[PDB]
Amino acid sequence: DVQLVESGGGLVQPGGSRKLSCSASGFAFSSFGMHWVRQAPEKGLEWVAYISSGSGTIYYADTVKGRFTISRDDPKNTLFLQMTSLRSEDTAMYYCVRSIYYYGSSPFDFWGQGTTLTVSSSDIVMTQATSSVPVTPGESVSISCRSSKSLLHSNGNTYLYWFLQRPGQSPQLLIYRMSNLASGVPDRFSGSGSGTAFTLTISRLEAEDVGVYYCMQHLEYPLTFGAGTKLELK
Amino acid sequence: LSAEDKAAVERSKMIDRNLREDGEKAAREVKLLLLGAGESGKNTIVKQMKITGIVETHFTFKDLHFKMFDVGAQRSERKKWIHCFEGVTAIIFCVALSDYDLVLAEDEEMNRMHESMKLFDSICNNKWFTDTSIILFLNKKDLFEEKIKKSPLTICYPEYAGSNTYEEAAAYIQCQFEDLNKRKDTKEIYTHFTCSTDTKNVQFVFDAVTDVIIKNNLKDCGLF
Amino acid sequence: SNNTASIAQARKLVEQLKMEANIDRIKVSKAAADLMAYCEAHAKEDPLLTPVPASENPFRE
Amino acid sequence: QRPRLSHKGPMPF
Amino acid sequence: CEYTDWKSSGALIPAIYMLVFLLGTTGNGLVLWTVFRSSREKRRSADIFIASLAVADLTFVVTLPLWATYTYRDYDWPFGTFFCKLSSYLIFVNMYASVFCLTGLSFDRYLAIVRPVANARLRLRVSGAVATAVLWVLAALLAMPVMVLRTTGDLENTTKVQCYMDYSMVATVSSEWAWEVGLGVSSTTVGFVVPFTIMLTCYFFIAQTIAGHFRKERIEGLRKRRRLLSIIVVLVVTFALCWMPYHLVKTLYMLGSLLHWPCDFDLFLMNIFPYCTCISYVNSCLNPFLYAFFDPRFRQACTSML
Amino acid sequence: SELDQLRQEAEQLKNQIRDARKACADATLSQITNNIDPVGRIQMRTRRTLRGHLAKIYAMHWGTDSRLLVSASQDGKLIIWDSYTTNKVHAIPLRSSWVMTCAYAPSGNYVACGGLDNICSIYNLKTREGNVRVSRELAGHTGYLSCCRFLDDNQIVTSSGDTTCALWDIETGQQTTTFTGHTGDVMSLSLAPDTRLFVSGACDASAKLWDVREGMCRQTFTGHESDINAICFFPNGNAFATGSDDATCRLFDLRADQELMTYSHDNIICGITSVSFSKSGRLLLAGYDDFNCNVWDALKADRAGVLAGHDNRVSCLGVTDDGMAVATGSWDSFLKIWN
């Protein structure tokens, strides 16, 4: 029922300016904090901007700046993203994210299919040193991740999120905030982990478990991703 | 505070602002209580001011949003759900003036008007309606006048009913209902002889509600 | 008729009263002892009865 | 000499 | 002529100053105690405005004894240059706050009981914290150029200290009086006059809209309507006869200085300013029992106050 | 007539029940627990003053996690409270603003409200829509709903104005059980910790122990002088407390079906709106009409504290599942967390 479709993109002249629009459906748009997340053509994800519900807090990244502007139209359920100068590093697979925040919420619950943008010719670091692991069916494999600062806040919870990017598919939330299972996700994707280095558990690996696993910290707003761990089916 | 904690705080502020807006909207709206003894004129009154539990009403007269909760169908102990209607501006007590020469057709010993008299006395002297005015509507005045032309009022009221004239009988009954208000200083009973074809009862309710609003504003300020 | 309905109501009231009267009972002394034993057993985990340190308090801290 | 009513008493002017 | 010589006046002003102190300080102490203890339960719309008026009078009479001893000492101000700057700042901002809380109460009563079905949103969006804040800030800004004049030091040098308003630190003696006239005229315009105009023009409408709604011809109804219609005038005219004498004697003197008004009057036109001052001061002590105390629920709240 | 004979039989049965209770009344709880150490004075201070409601709070209910909290009011709002940070998680606008009871499901995904509309409305707290939508309107009662408690995510028990209690199926809107044995207005129902025997109190000054798997008035509890307003099960499901407007609250056990203790004071002339029990069942907090909630020692009928600090009558009251806090609500539109 919940659907997010991205519009706008393609090829841009150097120092160009194009607006990316995201029209929402199937959920209460005005109660969700919209996001924008980019992805290099071969590398991992990267956070771009964030507009809260009610247009209260407008937080951008460091690589992108005043060129990138994020706007929300509660009416008509459209999320926007405009830029004023397109450097060569701005060619990416941009993704929209819905995020809702209360006590037991599940932030980064849903994503979108994304849109293509191509150019024309401190922050916590999530490393995830493991790059490729051959995986066999049923084999219980584990994915590691390490941050540059302790993610366990004084609220008794840590702000590490886990995502799965199947080949050719949009990123999907697996566990949110240190091993809390998301909605519509098989229970084989367990979590577990503590401290500043965190592990994962897949248990009975199936054909749908193939892909690349991404990390993200939600403690500080820079919101740094990490290079993923591809699971080659072998 | 973490990012999620601040976002939750912002959500709480948005919820608080919505609650404040809703409360301000509701504070500028008038609560009425349609509650009387006889249900025969109940339906007529509620229908004409409109045009399995608590039923609602929403009519706007002269830029005043009214809601009137008719609670006659509850058929439960009144002492437990009547404290809910404590903020009600006025109770529209509708009673049948044609119950004269009738004996309620059920008890066969006590008049329907006589029972409605105790019902009024209880409502008007209730603890929660100390400062709540009552808009008394005496319906079936046509049937009352034809019955008074048929026979005198002495049958229903042997204790000096007055005269055979409809005006005198109605005045005596209206006084016999008004004097039941022991607290004749805080509240004020608004009596109104309403015809079946009459359409000014909505205007009468509006006038009574405006007067009660002025009274409550006077009390809210220091001028009381 | 109404008389038959009253007879049925009286019969069901009598049946309910008999069923309630058939219930086995123990001593009030035993019930009080059980309540006291539960209270003494769980008296060490009640935060309201014995205030917990402010650090452990989810509200004070 | 006319006093200016400003010497004695508060509320100057 | 001149040579103001009233032994009785000099001997009497300190006593009445101290009397209005010993009356008003308590007369607002009880009001503050009530409006601060029994506030969240009563939730009256006038609590903010009566609280502002009560604190205005409290400050209006707190620094009275030093002025009284100033008069009694045959001048000779025994206090600092900054301190009676402070005193005048207080007893002037308090004057403005008193008249403006009276007019604010009048305006709130207008929006409450004149057009209750067409002015509720305006009343809730204006009559409240924001109106009080604007009133107090405006009072401070109108009393701003007052501490910019007062100094301290003798002019006869016969050990006669005074803290007159200098008017030379800001201007010259040539246009000195010619500009004090204008400053006092503007002060009269924004003091007694304008709040009196607004307060009367809205209390009159309150009467016009209440004498047709409480006029239900019934014994209790006439008593209630008589009470309200009488208290409206015992409200307006109290301000109107304890503030008008001050602003009339003052303006008569100021006009005469440029009119050479004869001195067959000066004997008391020069020495009734203390008496008009005392009358204006007792107006402050009379406010608590009229724009506050009257309402019996407030009264029984006062009985709850210790 | 035969009606007189049946009435005589009923009177004889009542006499037999009374005689059995009297025979089983060998001692008293007050005598048995007189040698124990007095609890002492428990002075609680408000930690969180939950503000935002704009009318009388008619009911509240704690969540299972002892942090989330739900409240209802005449404004027409059901508010989920984050008691730790005073954050309003949700704000549900009711269909009818005449609510007298609310419930938090043990799983935490459902909240139920009802009142003078005679409908128990169930709201879905967890949805991909990102909002709270009404999931089911359980209707069929002929009186105002006064108390509703969840058994599971698909089963609720509802005590209405009319003498009828109901066990409902959330999925299929039919009523599973009829629970028809009262002779008056039934206000408060409790629920055993095991959810197989729920007790309920009415306006006949009688409390009924109901069997929920089949439907049966297992036991009847008399002793009050006026209508029972509040009820609460003991931590262990073999006792419960009742509150009435006769200015008394009593302890009724189940295995002996007699009154154990009556908690009354001379200075208390007002009624009781809500009652509740603490963990270990040493404290019996009761919300009175004299504007303050009172802490009673359950084992010893003696004063142990007063939760003063509510302007109007204390309507609703509840203790957490972990016993950390007491959340008290009143008609002055304020929710207070006492610890």
Please tell me which chains touch B, using 3 or more CB pairs under 8 Å as the contact test.
A, E, F
User: What is the distance between the alpha carbons of residues F68 and E70, in angstroms, rounded to a whole number?
Assistant: 65
Q: How distant is the Cα of F245 from the closest Cα of chain A, in angstroms?
A: 39
Ordered by start, the domain boundaries in chain C are 7-59
Q: What is the DSSP letter of B163?
A: -
Sheet containing strand F68-73, edge to edge, reads F57-62, F68-73, F77-82, F87-93
Check if CATH label 3.40.50.300 holds for domain B30-212: yes
Domain membership flag for residue E1 = no
User: What is the distance between the alpha carbons of residues F293 and F230, in angstroms, rounded to a whole number?
Assistant: 13
Using CB atoms, pick whichever of F89, F108, F129 lies closest to residue A102: F89
Q: Which amino acid is at F336?
A: K
Q: Do chains B and C touch (3 or more CB pairs under 8 A)?
A: no
Query: Interior CA angle at E199 toward E196 and E202, to 5°?
Result: 145
Whether E228 sits inside 8 A of B223 (CB atoms) is yes
Shared-domain flag, residues A102 and A156: no
Shared-domain flag, residues A45 and A70: yes
Residue from A156, F46, F280, F287 nearest C47 by CA: F280
Interchain contact B87–E (C-beta under 8 A): no
Interchain contact E14–D (C-beta under 8 A): no
Whether C28 sits inside 8 A of F29 (CB atoms) is yes
User: What is the distance between the alpha carbons of residues A46 and A226, in angstroms, rounded to a whole number?
Assistant: 8
User: What is the distance between the alpha carbons of residues B89 and B211, in angstroms, rounded to a whole number?
Assistant: 10
User: What is the distance between the alpha carbons of residues F253 and F256, in angstroms, rounded to a whole number?
Assistant: 6
User: What is the distance between the alpha carbons of residues C17 and E132, in angstroms, rounded to a whole number?
Assistant: 70
Please answer whether residues A225 and A214 qualify as being in contact, where contact means their C-beta atoms are separated by less than 8 angstroms. yes
Discontinuities in chain F with C to N beyond 2.5 Å fall right after: none
Please answer whether residues F94 and A149 qualify as being in contact, where contact means their C-beta atoms are separated by less than 8 angstroms. no
Whether F128 sits inside 8 A of A31 (CB atoms) is no
- Pairing, β F145-152 against β F186-189: unpaired
Please tell me which chains touch F, using 3 or more CB pairs under 8 Å as the contact test.
A, B, C
Q: Is the dihedral of CA C7, C9, C14, C15 positive or negative?
A: positive
Query: Interior CA angle at A24 toward A18 and A27, to 5°?
Result: 160
Shared-domain flag, residues A10 and A115: yes
Ordered by start, the domain boundaries in chain B are 30-212
CA B1 to chain centre: 53
Using CB atoms, pick whichever of B12, B76, B87 lies closest to residue F144: B76
Q: Which amino acid is at E13?
A: I
Please answer whether residues F309 and F45 qualify as being in contact, where contact means their C-beta atoms are separated by less than 8 angstroms. no
In the three-class reduction of DSSP (H, G, I as helix; E, B as strand; rest coil), residue A82 is classed as strand
- Pairing, β B65-70 against β B30-34: parallel
Domain membership flag for residue E232 = yes
Sheet containing strand A211-217, edge to edge, reads A172-175, A160-165, A211-217, A229-231
Q: Tokens 């701005």 correspond to what residue?
A: A90
Quote the domain boundaries for residue F35: 1-339
Report CA-CA distances (Å) from F294 to E98, F16, F206, F227, F314: 45, 37, 23, 20, 10
Chain B hits for E296, Cβ within 8 Å: 224
What is the domain-level CATH number for residue A131? 2.60.40.10
Using CB atoms, pick whichever of F54, F79, F142 lies closest to residue B52: F142
What is the domain-level CATH number for residue E206? 1.20.1070.10
Interchain contact E184–D (C-beta under 8 A): yes
What is the domain-level CATH number for residue F98? 2.130.10.10
Return the CATH class of domain C7-59. few secondary structures
Experimental method: cryo-EM
Please answer whether residues A224 and A151 qualify as being in contact, where contact means their C-beta atoms are separated by less than 8 angstroms. no
Shared-domain flag, residues A157 and A90: no
Element (H, E) at B217: helix B201-220
Please tell me which chains touch A, using 3 or more CB pairs under 8 Å as the contact test.
B, F
Residue from F292, F264, F303 nearest F42 by CA: F303
User: What is the distance between the alpha carbons of residues F79 and C30, in angstroms, rounded to a whole number?
Assistant: 43
- Which string of DSSP letters, residue by residue, matches F192-225? -TTSSEEEEEETTS-EEEEETTTTEEEEEE---S
Quote the domain boundaries for residue E192: 7-304
User: C interface mutation test: which of F30, F255, F300, F328 has the most C CBs within 10 A?
Assistant: F255
Using CB atoms, pick whichever of F67, F82, F131 lies closest to residue A31: F131
Question: What is the SS3 string spanning E124-135?
Answer: HHHCCHHHHHHH
Element (H, E) at F13: helix F2-24
Report CA-CA distances (Å) from A7 to A24, A93, E146, E224, F50: 11, 12, 66, 71, 44
Quote the domain boundaries for residue A36: 4-119
Question: What is the SS3 string spanning chain E?
Answer: CCCCCCHHHHHHHHHHHHHHHHHHHHHHHHHHHHHHHCCCCCCCCCHHHHHHHHHHHHHHHHCCHHHHHHHHCCCCCCCCHHHHHHHHHHHHHHHHHHHHHHHHHHHHHHHHHCCCCCCHHHHHHHCCHHHHHHHHHHHHHHCHHHHCCECCCCCCCCCCCCCCECCCCCCCCCCHHHHHHHHHHHHHHHHHHHHHHHHHHHHHHHHHHHCCCCCCCCHHHHHHHHHHHHHHHHHHHHHHHHCHHHHHHHHHHHHHHCCCCCCCCHHHHCCCHHHHHHHHHHHHHHHHHHCCCCCHHHHHHHHHCC
Q: How many CA atoms lie within 13 A of A55 on its CB side?
A: 10
Report CA-CA distances (Å) from A158 to A176, E193, F84: 10, 66, 18
Tokens, residue E204: 């009159």
Residue from F148, F232, F140, F228 nearest F184 by CA: F228
Please answer whether residues A22 and A6 qualify as being in contact, where contact means their C-beta atoms are separated by less than 8 angstroms. yes
Please answer whether residues F182 and B76 qualify as being in contact, where contact means their C-beta atoms are separated by less than 8 angstroms. no
Q: E25 — phi, psi (to 5°)?
A: -60, -45
For chain E, what is the domain count?
1
How is chain A split among helix, strand and coil, in percent rounded to 5?
Answer: 5, 40, 55
Chain A hits for F82, Cβ within 8 Å: 102-103
Report CA-CA distances (Å) from B54 to A72, A200, B67: 42, 56, 12
CA A130 to chain centre: 19
- Pairing, β F57-62 against β F46-50: unpaired
Burial, F185: exposed, middle or buried (Cβ in 10 Å; 0-12, 13-18, 19+)? Answer: buried
User: What is the distance between the alpha carbons of residues F56 and B156, in angstroms, rounded to a whole number?
Assistant: 44
Task: Give the residues across from F47 on adjacent strands.
Answer: none
Determine the residue of chain E that is closest to D6 in CA distance.
E164
Task: Give the residues across from A198 on adjacent strands.
Answer: A145
Please answer whether residues E224 and E296 qualify as being in contact, where contact means their C-beta atoms are separated by less than 8 angstroms. no
Residues 6+ apart with CB under 8 A from B186: B130, B131
User: What is the distance between the alpha carbons of residues F83 and E38, in angstroms, rounded to a whole number?
Assistant: 28
- Other Cβ atoms less than 10 A from the Cβ of F181: the count is 22
Cα Rg of chain D (Å, integer): 7
Shared-domain flag, residues A114 and A130: no
Burial, F296: exposed, middle or buried (Cβ in 10 Å; 0-12, 13-18, 19+)? Answer: buried
Chain A hits for B5, Cβ within 8 Å: 155
User: What is the distance between the alpha carbons of residues F87 and E89, in angstroms, rounded to a whole number?
Assistant: 44
Q: A65 — phi, psi (to 5°)?
A: -150, -155
For chain F, what is the domain count?
1
User: What is the distance between the alpha carbons of residues F63 and F103, in angstroms, rounded to a whole number?
Assistant: 9
Chain F hits for A102, Cβ within 8 Å: 82, 87, 89-90
Rounded to the nearest 10 degrees, the angle between the axes of helix E176-188 and helix E244-257 is 160
Long-range Cβ contacts of C2-5 (<8 Å, 24+ apart): C3/F3
Rounded to the nearest 10 degrees, the angle between the axes of helix E244-257 and helix E219-242 is 30
